[PDB]
Design a protein around this ligand. Structure first.
Ligand code: NDP
Ligand code: 6VG
Lengths: 711, 262, 82
């Protein structure tokens, strides 16, 4: 209230003006009469990019390579996500490096475009933030220029690379050149010297000689004085390889267009075959390559798009899966890896390891870079330039910011209080925090663990390496609040306070006694002031990072019989605005009907549909990384044959108005993973007579569909 | 070529329960659905009654998903090779399942679970037991919308090992409830669709016969998940080494509106 | 004399897979000298460790296995001493 506060008292002056207007809601705030209103946040702001110090590349929708964005990296907290389960068995010593260039391999493109799910990767990467990028080249914490391989995501601006996977850049290569060496030559040595056991003078057959791993394989083999046969797509690749390696004549090149190389290699080797086969092609070329093997020859298959029968072989231990072995070695970093580290390190000194060709792409062109690798229209490495290399050779990395999308993260060394978190949304929210970094939770309840579902998930968290303490204490007195935070500071600095408590009593306002009225006013008023007070006083105030107070739509929509719950829920919404006046952190989600978890779980109330919890947590992530106090979130419930199938097909893609979107934009552009296409494929037959191919689905426009059903 | 099966998803068809099995609004044909179709086809080839035949499927790949059409009819064309046993469920020119099915007259069951009588989950407190409500809260949060016919597991332990699967006569639902012991053995937050069951044995001669017609208090068969061998067994059924493929979650409603109370 | 009763199993039924995996604490066996065929061969492969090696010296191989030898998919070690 301004210097002249209103004087509303019976026969006052300011009151008489209000009576004449006769408005149902008059609030005097910031010196003006007004009303509390819910202003819609545009959908474009949910993905708005803001400056951020630490970022990493991920995908908004899995299987779409046009949805790669830069998100906030939990490395701002020092550590990295995915420190649960197996990842806690290997206590590798890591060096925090500033990434200057990130190398792009065919492994990243395979994961990004949905050809392989992240579950095929090593189990230590199951809970990682992202799975894109392994190699990099930058500066370590001491300013030295380094390059190496680290568990993903190395497609970021800061990495925590194990000290046993980090090489030193010679003082002749720019940081740009060093970004091409590590993985290409690390895999070449693994395929030849570690798995193939190549020997001096042996004959080796390399598929896809022009690829980055193909070029590295040739260089290693030539250093071993081998007889080389390589498959080159076109004459440009053959010419390129000849220029890079003068020892190669036209006699060492074949064609990948058909399996005619078998006779050539089987005549030039005089029927002995090839000692080592680095195999990337599949189908009949795989069979022909096997038939070229000598009697002691080794077949190293590093292709990614394996068939179904050969995928069964991997499961039943019939064959070894070598297409994700470099990733597995980097997790363990045991004797097998140190052999490759020594080999590559030796190669650098002896001149075998030489930088490959390169093609730098800016950070914002990540989508274009990924498409370039997938097409394979030309040879060379694709490297994303994160920063600009300084002229000096040992200098600190300047502190800069990058545009990235929000991603909430919790400090692993800080304890988080979840008051009333042992129920409904609390347990499935604590699961979310654990996956996003939280490793110290204090769940509070009035009774304790009282159901089998609670005991199961609390046991699940403890198994993952989280420290959970369950207190049966209601915070309705300063003494209890001290006890709860005492058990908190003994686990770590208090870095979050969430209140998800509710005690509902429903009845008509006239039939409610005093005791019945103040039932929902203990977890929403009495608590929130005692938790607020603690966060305002040290040592929590300096340490506190989040302060979340869950609320309901009764504050903005109202309800019948819940006059008490409305009163308490609003006071919680105003205690969370006093915090904003004083600059303290505060968040207050104002939910609507929610599904799968709680009160509603046990549908349509006030015409609003219940939300799916996997959305509750998607918007909740937006809520935490925002400047407003309360963010209202709710869901509202919603001819010719040619238009019939169009609506059904458009509905599959997640489009509400088929006519709104462009009729010339291909389905893959909007996004068609692997299940939407089959649904459309079976729907174009169920609804009409059309029978289309799965691949044809993703490259056909809406106009094509309309013009095809008529035919 | 061989037996063609017509799944009638009408208002009162006996196979109307197949619609009470959806994954985030997608009404898919159960992965164990193709097991019964292949199992019944082999019996029809042999001339014996499918409930008197002890089978064993191997490497059952669910090549592609079958979207059941509500209030309609779907057709499949199961085909079993006489001597080798290669079975194949298909719809037109599209493959939907594959594998090898073999019958035998001897013991086909590895784990000795068909002998267990009662239930280990007796006398335990309520805070050391999961019930039907809580088991299918775990599945629902992961995207698996099970209805009332597929909600078989009546009780379980916090370890997910012991269960009280219900036997009510329907085979497509029973084999799915045995495959639910696998899903709740891998706690998580993502949605996984099974795509390869390496071994399935459905010896019915050690399995309780169909409930007497008119029954409503269906009996419960003790089940167990073997974390060592990766075997889910209950009564006269075992499923070993079942693998799944992660799938993105679909929003059945429309995007929420976010406002700023100010 | 070094061997104890704990080191032996039964060749009549494929119950060794459970016992061996339990006794090895899930690490698997590093080398397998395999002579049995059928369901015992598959079970032996599933005990293989991450690095584990499978040496198959049985003579009465199945037709599918024999085709694998011809195709160079697998090595034929049953007549290697010869
Ligand atoms: N559920 C929904 O759809 C909606 C939820 N919200 C908000 O989200 C949260 C929903 O949580 P939900 O689990 O759904 O509610 P539930 O009723 O399902 O469980 C809420 C938890 O509150 C705990 N609790 C209540 N009083 C106290 C107390 N004095 N001290 C400690 N713990 C307490 C209970 O633990 P015990 O029972 O062990 O005492 C219970 O587990 C609430 O904050 C609610 O306001 C907002 C709008 C709608
Ligand atoms: P693309 O990467 O080709 O996608 C492959 C898909 C479409 C995922 C295919 O493998 C598939 O649909 N498999 C799933 C089969 C299935 O639905 N099995 C389980 C039945 S539904 C259930 C668990 O509710």
């Amino acid at each position: 209230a301004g210097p002249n506060p209103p004087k509303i008292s019976a026969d006052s002056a300011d009151f008489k003006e209000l009576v004449r207007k006769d408005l149902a809601y008059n609030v005097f705030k910031n010196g003006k009469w007004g009303t509390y209103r819910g202003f819609v946040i545009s959908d474009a702001d949910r993905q708005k990019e803001r400056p951020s110090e630490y970022v990493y590349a991920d995908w908004l929708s899995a299987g779409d390579m046009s949805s790669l964005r830069w998100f906030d990296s939990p490395l701002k907290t020092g550590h990295n996500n995915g420190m649960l389960g197996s990842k806690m068995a290997h206590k590798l010593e890591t060096e925090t490096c500033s990434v200057y260039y990130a190398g792009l391999n065919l492994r990243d493109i395979i994961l990004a475009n949905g050809t392989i799910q992240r579950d095929i990767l090593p189990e230590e990467t199951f809970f990682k933030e992202g799975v894109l990028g392994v190699e990099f080249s930058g500066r370590n914490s001491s300013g030295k220029r380094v390059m190496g391989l680290c568990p993903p995501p190395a497609l970021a601006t800061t990495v925590k690379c194990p000290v046993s996977s980090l090489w030193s850049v010679p003082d002749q290569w720019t940081l740009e050149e060093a970004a091409t060496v590590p993985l290409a030559y690390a895999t070449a040595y693994y395929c030849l010297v570690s798995e193939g056991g190549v020997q001096k003078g042996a004959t080796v057959f390399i598929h896809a000689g022009a690829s980055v791993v193909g070029q590295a394989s040739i260089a290693v083999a030539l250093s071993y004085n081998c007889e080389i046969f390589t498959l080159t797509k076109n004459s440009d690749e053959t010419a390129l390889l000849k220029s890079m390696y003068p020892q190669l004549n036209d006699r060492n090149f074949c064609s990948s267009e058909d399996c005619s190389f078998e006779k050539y290699i089987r005549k030039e080797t005089k029927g002995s075959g090839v000692d080592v086969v680095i195999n990337t092609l599949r189908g009949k070329f795989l069979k022909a390559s096997r038939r070229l093997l000598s009697k002691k020859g080794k077949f190293v298959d590093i292709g990614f798009k394996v068939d179904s029968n050969t995928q069964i072989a991997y499961y039943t231990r019939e064959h070894p899966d070598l297409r994700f072995q470099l990733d597995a070695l980097l997790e363990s970093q045991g004797p097998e890896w140190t052999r490759l580290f020594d080999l590559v390190q030796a190669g650098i000194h002896s001149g075998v390891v030489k930088p490959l060709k390169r093609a730098v792409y800016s950070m914002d062109k990540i989508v274009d870079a990924f498409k370039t690798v997938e097409a394979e229209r030309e040879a060379g490495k694709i490297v994303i330039k994160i920063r600009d290399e300084e002229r000096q050779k040992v200098c600190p990395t300047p502190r800069t910011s990058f545009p990235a999308i929000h991603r909430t993260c919790f400090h692993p060394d800080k304890s988080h209080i979840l008051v009333g978190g042992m129920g409904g949304m609390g347990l499935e929210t604590a699961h979310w925090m654990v996956l996003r970094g939280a490793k110290k939770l204090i769940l509070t309840s009035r009774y304790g663990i009282t159901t089998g579902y609670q005991a199961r998930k609390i046991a699940f968290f403890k198994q993952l390496g989280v420290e959970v303490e369950v207190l049966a204490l209601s915070v309705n007195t300063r003494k209890a609040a001290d006890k709860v935070f005492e058990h908190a500071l003994k686990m770590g600095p208090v870095g979050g306070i969430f209140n998800m408590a509710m005690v509902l009593y429903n009845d008509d306002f006239l039939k409610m006694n005093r005791e019945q009225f103040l039932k929902p006013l203990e977890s929403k008023i009495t608590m929130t002031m005692l938790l607020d007070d603690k966060s305002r006083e040290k040592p929590v105030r300096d340490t506190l990072d989040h302060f979340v107070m869950f609320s309901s739509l009764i504050v903005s929509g109202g309800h019948l019989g819940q006059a008490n719950y409305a009163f308490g829920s609003t006071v919680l919404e105003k205690i969370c605005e006093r915090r904003k006046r004083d600059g303290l952190p505060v968040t207050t989600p104002q939910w609507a009907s929610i599904a799968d978890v709680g009160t509603v779980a046990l549908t349509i109330i006030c015409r609003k549909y219940p939300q799916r919890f996997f959305n509750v947590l998607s918007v909740f992530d937006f809520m935490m990384s925002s400047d407003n106090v309360v963010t209202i979130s709710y869901v509202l419930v919603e001819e010719s044959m040619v238009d019939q199938v169009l609506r059904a097909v458009g509905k599959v893609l997640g489009i509400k108005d088929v006519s709104s979107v462009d009729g010339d934009k291909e389905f893959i552009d909007m996004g068609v993973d692997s299940l939407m296409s089959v649904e459309i494929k079976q729907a174009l037959e169920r609804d009409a007579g059309l029978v289309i191919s799965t691949k044809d689905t993703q490259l056909m426009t809406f106009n094509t569909l309309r013009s095809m059903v008529k035919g | 070529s061989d037996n063609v099966i017509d799944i009638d998803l009408s208002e009162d068809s006996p196979e109307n329960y197949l619609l009470e099995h959806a994954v985030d609004g997608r009404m898919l044909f159960p992965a164990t659905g193709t097991l019964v179709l292949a199992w019944k086809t082999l019996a029809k080839l042999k001339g014996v009654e499918f409930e008197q035949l002890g089978v064993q499927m191997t490497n059952v790949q669910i090549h592609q998903a079958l979207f059941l059409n509500p209030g309609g009819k779907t057709t499949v064309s199961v085909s079993v090779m006489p001597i080798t046993g290669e079975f194949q469920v298909r719809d037109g020119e599209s493959l939907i399942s594959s594998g090898v099915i073999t019958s035998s007259e001897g013991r086909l069951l590895e784990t000795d679970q068909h002998m267990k009588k009662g239930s280990v989950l007796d006398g335990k407190p309520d805070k050391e037991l999961l019930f039907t409500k809580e088991i299918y809260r775990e599945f629902l949060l992961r995207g698996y919308e099970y209805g009332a016919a597929f909600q078989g597991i009546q009780r379980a332990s916090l370890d997910a090992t012991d269960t009280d699967i219900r036997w009510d006569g329907r085979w497509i639902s029973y084999l799915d409830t045995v495959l639910q012991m696998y899903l709740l053995s891998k706690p998580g937050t993502h949605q996984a669709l099974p795509t390869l069951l390496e071994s399935v044995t459905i010896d019915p001669r050690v399995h309780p016969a169909q409930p007497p017609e008119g029954t409503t208090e269906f009996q419960v068969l003790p089940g167990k998940w073997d974390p060592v061998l990766q075997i889910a067994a209950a009564g006269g059924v075992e499923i070993r080494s079942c693998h799944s493929i992660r799938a993105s979650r679909r929003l059945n409603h429309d995007p929420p509106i976010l406002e700023d109370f100010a």
